Amino acid sequence: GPHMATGQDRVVALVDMDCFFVQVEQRQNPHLRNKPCAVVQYKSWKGGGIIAVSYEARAFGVTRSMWADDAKKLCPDLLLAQVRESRGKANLTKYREASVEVMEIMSRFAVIERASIDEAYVDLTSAVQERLQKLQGQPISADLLPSTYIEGLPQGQKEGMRKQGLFQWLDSLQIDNLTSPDLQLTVGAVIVEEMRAAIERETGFQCSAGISHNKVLAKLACGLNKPNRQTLVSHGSVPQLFSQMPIRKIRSLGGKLGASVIEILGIEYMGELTQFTESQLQSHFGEKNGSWLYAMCRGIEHDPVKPRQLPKTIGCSKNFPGKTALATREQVQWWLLQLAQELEERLTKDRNDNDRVATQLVVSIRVQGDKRLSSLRRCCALTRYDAHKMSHDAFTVIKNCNTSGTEWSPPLTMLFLCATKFSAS
DNA sequence: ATTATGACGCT
């Protein structure tokens, strides 16, 4: 009863840019705005691989990781923007720079954890406390939440439903208790409306967000109402929400572990997990995963929002699938050089912008017919930002994979250079 | 012949 902590200490938001690469291209080219459109990489093989889809195109069934020529069969009016190509590979620079615009706006409100190029977590606990004090008892007006959904409401036209749910929530609110978790979530959501308005004002980009008490719930909430909307998942909404929530929808359970939870326990939904003791879960899935599952199915997670706006590693990758796999020494060298040249550019810009130097180079390769995604990974020292030296060292470090008697065998289907181990500069 | 990344756990 009084001693079961309920994981309501924090207010955490997950902000995700709606179809981010597509919006970047639509800002740059107005002819694409408010249309079925997608962003592709390469163009020769089946029109190119789609990596981002507007919501208009999604309504036709167009999805990420689909060939453009097939997408065109579903959506013949589909419009396509192409990723920039430099040194024979995809160059994502435009999107990393748009991402930094967004992150820098978010950082004005609260400390953020860059979780990917287009999404960040936000620790709003301090911001909510400050804002609650600033209100000094004033009740929260629906006008302050024009795009917020309250999950699980209403109980007992889409915008009409949204407003009814919000009204039920706000009418039920106890504004005089500065320590009510539900009030804290609500003020968090007001702040998130303000953040999303500033992002759209200053970049043109729209986003969705989730507001809850931890990262996993915030992330799950963000996806409930997209695009251009935000969702508040309260502690109290967890039993009903989780009672039909497939386990695979929870962050980190979408893969093998989630499938084994399903297979070993004989269950389907997150909420069914409540019926197992902590020890049972640890027995099946190990101590860490067991404790984490026991708390997560009750809506409780303690992973902190890390104060980290910048990526921890800077990486350059290219697949050489099918018959394009690299089969000679000259080929492996020339592509290591192309990769090292993009890496040098990104690293020099990173050192100037962010006052830090990488110190370790990681080289990863895949060989043709190898089951694994990394056939090998080896590290060496990264001492100067010189593409010729980094490519020479990556070769020096992988070359004993060749089994030829100037040829290269097994042919290489992936090269990957990653600068890691940053130190302040 | 989804690709290009990037965080993090295990041992």
Ligand SMILES: Nc1nc2c(ncn2[C@H]2C[C@H](O)[C@@H](COP(=O)(O)OP(=O)(O)OP(=O)(O)O)O2)c(=O)[nH]1
């Ligand atoms: N190169 C590459 N980029 C990807 C890949 N997956 C996603 N991206 C890019 C394009 C996306 O806009 C962005 C973030 O991906 P998300 O999963 O958040 O989807 P997206 O933002 O496109 O749409 P949504 O958030 O659902 O509105 O990162 C990928 O596999 N390869």
Ligand SMILES: [Mn+2]
């Ligand atoms: Mn997104």
Ligand SMILES: [Mn+2]
């Ligand atoms: Mn995202």
